[PDB]
Amino acid sequence: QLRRIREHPCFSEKACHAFGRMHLPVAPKCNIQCKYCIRDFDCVNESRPGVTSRVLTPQEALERVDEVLSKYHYIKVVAVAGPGEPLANEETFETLRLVGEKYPHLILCISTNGLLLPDRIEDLDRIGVTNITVTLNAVDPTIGEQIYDYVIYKGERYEGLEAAKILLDNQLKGIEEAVRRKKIVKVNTVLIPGINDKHVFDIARKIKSMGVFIHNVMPLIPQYKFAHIKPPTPEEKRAIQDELSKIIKQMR
């Protein structure tokens, strides 16, 4: 195959060399704190590091779509991926509702840390989102606890193992529900040497059974509490990716 994969640069190798995507930075708030993230910068799960985007209101974001779709025609996808957690900001839903209603041809895409995916998947479906990226760095909460300072869920900040268990249970429930609703799911995993760099095999097996379409293993960008960790070398990353390809399709 369907068009939401074939023409999405992040879900098809062929589409990456042919079609473009644009991000609308309408979602400044975040609801967790990753130990590799400095909040000054656009969510590094779905952005190159060290970037500071101007935050747009839904109306301004629609205006940027208008102008981009005028100067360029290769644009197939419009997404919200930052600067914080898209599902933690009502402006995400207002923006994609405006874009989808005016430009039904565009593929609507979102990235999420997954915490609010169970609570908001019904909204995403109703507004026409067909592609969802979830960043899943652990399927064992004792490993998750090593990756997150805290999560904010339903008006309470949690730390430690409790926070990790709340996050993981919601990520899995949300992915399951997204798959049930025939959404195309991509899972990002930040490869963190010494923390989840062999656990990623367990992640791949789990998301494969759950119906995730593609897996994107990203090398750690050392920052914040992980600033001292030596990132995986390129050849180290390709070796893991090559092995994980026998479990689930890898984004290359």
- Mark the binding-site residues for [4Fe-4S] cluster, compressed into ranges: 10, 23, 30, 34, 37, 43, 46, 109
Give, in order, the Cα–Cα distances in Å from 169 to each of 2, 13, 23: 30, 31, 28
The nearest distance, CB 2 to Cl ion, in angstroms, is 3
Q: Which of residues 28-47 bind ligand SF4 (CB under 6 A)?
A: 30, 32-34, 37, 39, 43-46
At residue 230's C-alpha, the angle toward residues 224 and 232, to 5°, is 115
Pick between residue 79 and residue 168 the one whose CB is nearest to ligand SF4: 79
Give, as one character, the DSSP assignment of residue 250.
Answer: B
Query: Applying CB under 6 A, does 215 fall inside the site for ligand SF4?
Result: no
SS (H, E, C) 158-174: EEHHHHHHHHHHHHHHH
DSSP 88: G
The answer to whether residue 182 forms part of the interface with Cl ion (CB under 5 A) is no
Residue 102 makes contact with Cl ion by CB under 5 A: no
Check residue 40 for interaction with Cl ion (CB under 5 A).
no
In the three-class reduction of DSSP (H, G, I as helix; E, B as strand; rest coil), residue 131 is classed as strand
CB of 25 to Cl ion, least distance (A): 27
Q: Among residue numbers 106 through 125, which ones bind ligand SF4 (CB under 6 A)?
A: 109, 111, 113
Residue with tokens 């994609």: 96
Nearer to ligand SF4, 46 or 200 (CB): 46
**Which residues from 3-32 bind Cl ion, rule CB under 5 A?**
3-4
CA distances from 58 to 52, 78, 249 (A): 18, 13, 34
* Between 33 and 189, CB nearer to ligand SF4: 33
